[PDB]
Every structure is written in structure tokens, then in C-alpha cells.
């Protein structure tokens, strides 16, 4: 008289916190609760009331034949740090599994537009051993943190949490037994560019702009020597930035500004020497005090395509 239909599992995910982004590894940490509910065969409980079984005691019930399927985080890195866990067994057959978890999760993250980047933090959940003929997800609900003021937070959550329930078919695996039910949660976020605009981009602009002042010096010697102090100032600034900003395998927006600075100061050095060593006149072409910042900003504009 068995029931061979798939077991419908309802899932709720409570996300406490997302943090600890690691840019090079493209990972992030998630702390929260996972709640899974399904209906089994009815049972007798003490006093015909719901029965609570915590932590180690859960293992005793699995040994007695209680079915408690393992649900794997597909995109977790290593074994997640599972805290308290609990089962609730109802007389009518309901079974609810609840667990606190902390894990590091991976996803495709693109930081090229840093510090103005947007990211999709994703949770992917799937049964470890049971295909969708035995265990299928029926619904997914996600509850996040109530935010007071976002100006203090590194990331700003734009929009409600998106969810999906799909099927994953594996070729490497009877017919119709190679398909697993998967839940996908997505939290869209946008970085807080404030800190990076005032402490990094703005001071770097004043530096590059300040380097354009070499054209206002009234001597070749003064123009060429001060340029070297400017160059030294961009290099000293590249260290300050690299020491704080995240490591990546590609350049960001700030990295390109720094390169633009190197190019500006190097270009000015070639112009200072050409003007002075092409003729014997020089001071008049050095009156490019306006032409240089425009050419930089001009190129600076076509870089934004």
C-alpha cells in the first residue's frame, strides 16, 4: 500500500546577514536559517501534541527509520557551519526540519565597474541523494533583515528576493531518475560608492589636475623636475589604494584613473622636452595649459564607452 509519489518539500530561508565578500575567490558569507517541511505517515506522539527533537537526538530517530533527507547547498564552499538543528513531528504526519547555518557561498561576480558594481548573491539548494521522482521542491519563501538606515551599510539591497524552482538533469547518471529538484534564491545588491568617491577618487583627481600645473612654471628645468615629483606622487598613491582596495584579476575604474595619471605625466614630460629641444618659441607652446587638460578629459571621455 506504499506511496510512490514524490515527497513535496516546502522550504523557507531566513537570511540574517550577507557579508565577508572575498573578491578574488568570488565568495561571500551567509548566516541564516533553513526550514524544510514535508508530510509523512501519521504517528503517535506524547499527548497527541507536536514532538520536538533537538540536535543529537535527531540521529537516534534516523537510526529508527525516520526519513530525514540531506539537502546540499550546491554553491557552498566547504562544509557549512551548522548550528542548532531541530525536528518537529506532528501526529498527522507533518515533519519540519529547521537549522541555523553559516557558510561561504560562491557565484559569478564581476567587479570591473568597482566601486559602482552591482552583484547577485545566490543560494542554490538541492537534495543530495533523491531525484525529483522521490523528492521535489514545492515552494520557496525568503525572509531578509529589516533595515533601518542603509547609509552605514556596505551594500544596498535593491528589490525583493527572487526565487526559482527548476529541474537539473544529469547525463552522468532506470529512466527518469537522473533529474533533481533545485531551489535558487537571488539577492540583488549595489555597492555603496561613498567611501571610494571621497577617500580615493577625489584625492586622485586633485593629484592628476595638480600635475597639469607644471605648464605654469617659467623654466624648462622647473617643468621637467616637478613632473618627476608628480610621477612620484601617483606611485605613492597607487600603493595607498592597492593596500586597501580588493584584489582582482582585472583592472577597476580606479586602476584606470591611476594609469591615466601615469600617461598624463609621461605625456607632459615628452611635451616639455620637445618644446625646449626642438627650437631655440619654447615658452609659447608651453602655453598649452588649457590644451592638455582638455586632451586628457577628451581621451578620458572615450574611455567611458
Amino acid at each position: 500500500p506504499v506511496d510512490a509519489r514524490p515527497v513535496d518539500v516546502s522550504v523557507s530561508i531566513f537570511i540574517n546577514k550577507i557579508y565577508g565578500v572575498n573578491t578574488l575567490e568570488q565568495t561571500y558569507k551567509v548566516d541564516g536559517y533553513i526550514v524544510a517541511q514535508w508530510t509523512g505517515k501519521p504517528r503517535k506522539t506524547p499527548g497527541d501534541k507536536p514532538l520536538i527533537v533537538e540536535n543529537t537526538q535527531i540521529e537516534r530517530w534516523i537510526n529508527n527509520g525516520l526519513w530525514v533527507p540531506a539537502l546540499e547547498f550546491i554553491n557552498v564552499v566547504g562544509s557549512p557551519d551548522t548550528g542548532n538543528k531541530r525536528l518537529m513531528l506532528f501526529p498527522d504526519g507533518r515533519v519540519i526540519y529547521n537549522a541555523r547555518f553559516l557558510g561561504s557561498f560562491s557565484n559569478d561576480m564581476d567587479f570591473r565597474l568597482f566601486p559602482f558594481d552591482r552583484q547577485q548573491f545566490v543560494l542554490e539548494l538541492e537534495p543530495f541523494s533523491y531525484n525529483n521522482q522521490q523528492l521535489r521542491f514545492s515552494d520557496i519563501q525568503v525572509y531578509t533583515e529589516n533595515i533601518d538606515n542603509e547609509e552605514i551599510d556596505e551594500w544596498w539591497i535593491r528589490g525583493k528576493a527572487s526565487t526559482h524552482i527548476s529541474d537539473i538533469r544529469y547525463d552522468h547518471l532506470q529512466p527518469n531518475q537522473n533529474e533533481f529538484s533545485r531551489i535558487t534564491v537571488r539577492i540583488d545588491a549595489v555597492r555603496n560608492p561613498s567611501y571610494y568617491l571621497w577617500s580615493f577618487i577625489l584625492p586622485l583627481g586633485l593629484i592628476i589636475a595638480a600635475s597639469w600645473s607644471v605648464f605654469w612654471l617659467e623654466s624648462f628645468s622647473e617643468r621637467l623636475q616637478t613632473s618627476f615629483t608628480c610621477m612620484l606622487t601617483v606611485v605613492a598613491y597607487a600603493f595607498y589604494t592597492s593596500n586597501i582596495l580588493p584584489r582582482l584579476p582585472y583592472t577597476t575604474v580606479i586602476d584606470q584613473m591611476i594609469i591615466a595619471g601615469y600617461g598624463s605625466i609621461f605625456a607632459a614630460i615628452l611635451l616639455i622636452i620637445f618644446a625646449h629641444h626642438r627650437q631655440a618659441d619654447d615658452l609659447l607652446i608651453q602655453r598649452s595649459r588649457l590644451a592638455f587638460p582638455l586632451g586628457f578629459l577628451a581621451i578620458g571621455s572615450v574611455l567611458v564607452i
Epitope: 531566513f14 540574517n16 525572509y143 531578509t144 533583515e145 529589516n146 533595515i147 533601518d148 538606515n149 542603509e150
Partner: nanobody
Framework: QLQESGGGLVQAGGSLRLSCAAS????????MGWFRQAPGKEREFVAT????????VYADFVKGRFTLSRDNAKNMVYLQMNSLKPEDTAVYYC?????????????????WGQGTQVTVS
């Protein structure tokens, strides 16, 4: 600025619906909480929203008798108070959480309202 209303006199066992109008820079009603202060006693917490979605924090004397709700459209919160008893007589204030790390601490609230009196016989 915050303004309370909905207080008054009620018979032991009756109900009241306090209202707190919020005006100004307030992105969400989550920051708002209810307090009460009887004559001679200190201002004690009553209710505010919980950190995680779906949760609400209530003082231990509430015992399920009060219910905090919010109308983000009108940018407001309501304290539905039932099964009132003489012990609940006090001035009920509405506050706005201005930082800190304690939802239940009056020290972390500013912009208090004038308060609205609740009196139970």
C-alpha cells in the same frame, strides 16, 4: 517630529488603538517603537519591529495583548492594545531609533512625541 494619538479612558478589559504619525527623513517605519511612562516610574519599552522579517519585539508585560502594525503608505505605526488593565495606565510615547545596538533601549531613540495618555480603571 512624531505625534501620538488614540489614548483616552477605557474600562478594564477594553481596547484602544494608538497611532503615531511620522514626518521627516524616515525611509521606513521600522525605526519606530512604542514606550510608556507612568507617573514616578521610568520610561519602559513596549513594542518595536524585529530585526528579521516577520518578527516583532514586545515587552514582557504585553503577553500578547498588544500588536504593533505599520502603514508605510501613510508612514505610520499603530499599537492595538487589548485586554487592558489598570497596570497599563501611563503616557504612551512614540520614538524613532537613531542608531545604537539595542531595540529595547530608550537611550537609542530620539524625536520623541508629546505622548498620549492611556487610563484604565
Amino acid at each position: 517630529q512624531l505625534q501620538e494619538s488614540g489614548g483616552g479612558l477605557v474600562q478594564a478589559g477594553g481596547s484602544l488603538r494608538l497611532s503615531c504619525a511620522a514626518s521627516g527623513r524616515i525611509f521606513s517605519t521600522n525605526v519606530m517603537g512604542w514606550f510608556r511612562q507612568a507617573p514616578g516610574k521610568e520610561r519602559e519599552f513596549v513594542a518595536t519591529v524585529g530585526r528579521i522579517g516577520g518578527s516583532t519585539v514586545y515587552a514582557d508585560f504585553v503577553k500578547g495583548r498588544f500588536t504593533l502594525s505599520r502603514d508605510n503608505a501613510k508612514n505610520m505605526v499603530y499599537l492595538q492594545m487589548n485586554s487592558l488593565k489598570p497596570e497599563d495606565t501611563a503616557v504612551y510615547y512614540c520614538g524613532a531609533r537613531i542608531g545604537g545596538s539595542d531595540r529595547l533601549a530608550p537611550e537609542n531613540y530620539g524625536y520623541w512625541g508629546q505622548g498620549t495618555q492611556v487610563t484604565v480603571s
